[PDB]
């Protein structure tokens, strides 16, 4: 009700398949309104659902009655899982990632330098 959301420097990216712009959220008295709540506002504004909307990078000002951050609104989920960062899909978990945790991968790959050919042992390793 008392939030308000304005837009800025709006672009219609035919070639990244997206409406991308700066969101500028006046929001005095409250506590940097959450990203879910920004996307549901954007949907009513742009008449285009929340799933294709991806929002990020909100910085809140000193004092506090203004935040500012980038968001874009894809043409479809088809596209929004194509010309889109993986981490940001995983922000609303639709393209999560594996939990190997780097170091374990590096130490496996540093073995197998040891062994030649053994498809099953090379698969094994660790």
């Amino acid at each position: 009700d008392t939030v308000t959301i304005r837009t800025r420097k709006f672009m219609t990216n035919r070639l990244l398949q997206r409406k991308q712009m700066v969101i500028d959220v006046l929001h005095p008295g409250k506590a940097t309104v959450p990203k879910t709540e920004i996307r549901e506002k954007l949907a009513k504004m742009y008449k285009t659902t929340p799933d294709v909307i991806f929002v990020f990078g909100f910085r809140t000002h000193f004092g506090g009655g203004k935040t500012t951050g980038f968001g874009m609104i894809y043409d479809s989920l088809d596209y929004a899982k194509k010309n889109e960062p993986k981490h940001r899909l995983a922000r609303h978990g639709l393209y999560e990632k594996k939990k190997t945790s780097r170091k374990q991968r590096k130490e496996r790959k540093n073995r197998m330098k040891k062994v030649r050919g053994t498809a099953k042992a090379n698969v094994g390793a660790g």
Binding site: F62, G63, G64, G65
Partner: protein, 185 residues
């Protein structure tokens, strides 16, 4: 390699003859007038001033009509007018060198928070600014030193969410109302 700037300077210069006495007197008188915090705060202004005075010297050694002076000078003056130090009409460069500390303190926030009633003594003013009580234009200025443009001055006042300027009352009054409601009443 990295990113990282490294670009940074000091803001002041410490005086060579370090107990001139007369110097001390004038410097404290300045700390008293304009509620300053420290000997540095005077010195950092005194260092800004100088820089301007230096530049203005350098421009005067050039010939007139020479594009460098005409350009910079104008800007340097236009800058000094914008902060409400130099006066329109008094814009012509030689008049800069005739200038002083006191004038560059006069256009602090604190000094303009005291002057523009609001406060109630230069000390009080300084506290408020810090406490997140006063706002310039729209942003809450936290910082005493905020030099206030001549443009900006008429838009200085309290913040819209802060006791003095029509806001939810602070936690001290808020406690005593709870004491009067539950405890006394």
């Amino acid at each position: 390699p990295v990113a990282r700037s490294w670009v940074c300077r000091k803001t002041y210069v410490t005086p060579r003859r370090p107990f001139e006495k007369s110097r001390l007197d004038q410097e404290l008188k300045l700390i008293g007038e304009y509620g300053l915090r420290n000997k540095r705060e005077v010195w950092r202004v005194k260092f800004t001033l100088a820089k301007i005075r230096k530049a203005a010297r350098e421009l005067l050694t050039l010939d007139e009509k020479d594009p460098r002076r005409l350009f910079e000078g104008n800007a340097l003056l236009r800058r000094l007018v914008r902060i409400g130090v130099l006066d329109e009409g008094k814009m012509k460069l030689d008049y800069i060198l005739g200038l002083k500390i006191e004038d560059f303190l006069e256009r602090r926030l604190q000094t303009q928070v005291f002057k523009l009633g609001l406060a109630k003594s230069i000390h009080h003013a300084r506290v408020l600014i810090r406490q997140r009580h006063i706002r310039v234009r729209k942003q809450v200025v936290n910082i005493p030193s905020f030099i206030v443009r001549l443009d900006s001055q008429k838009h200085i006042d309290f913040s819209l969410r802060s006791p003095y300027g029509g806001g939810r009352p602070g936690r001290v009054k808020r406690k005593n109302a709870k004491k009067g409601q539950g405890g006394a009443g």
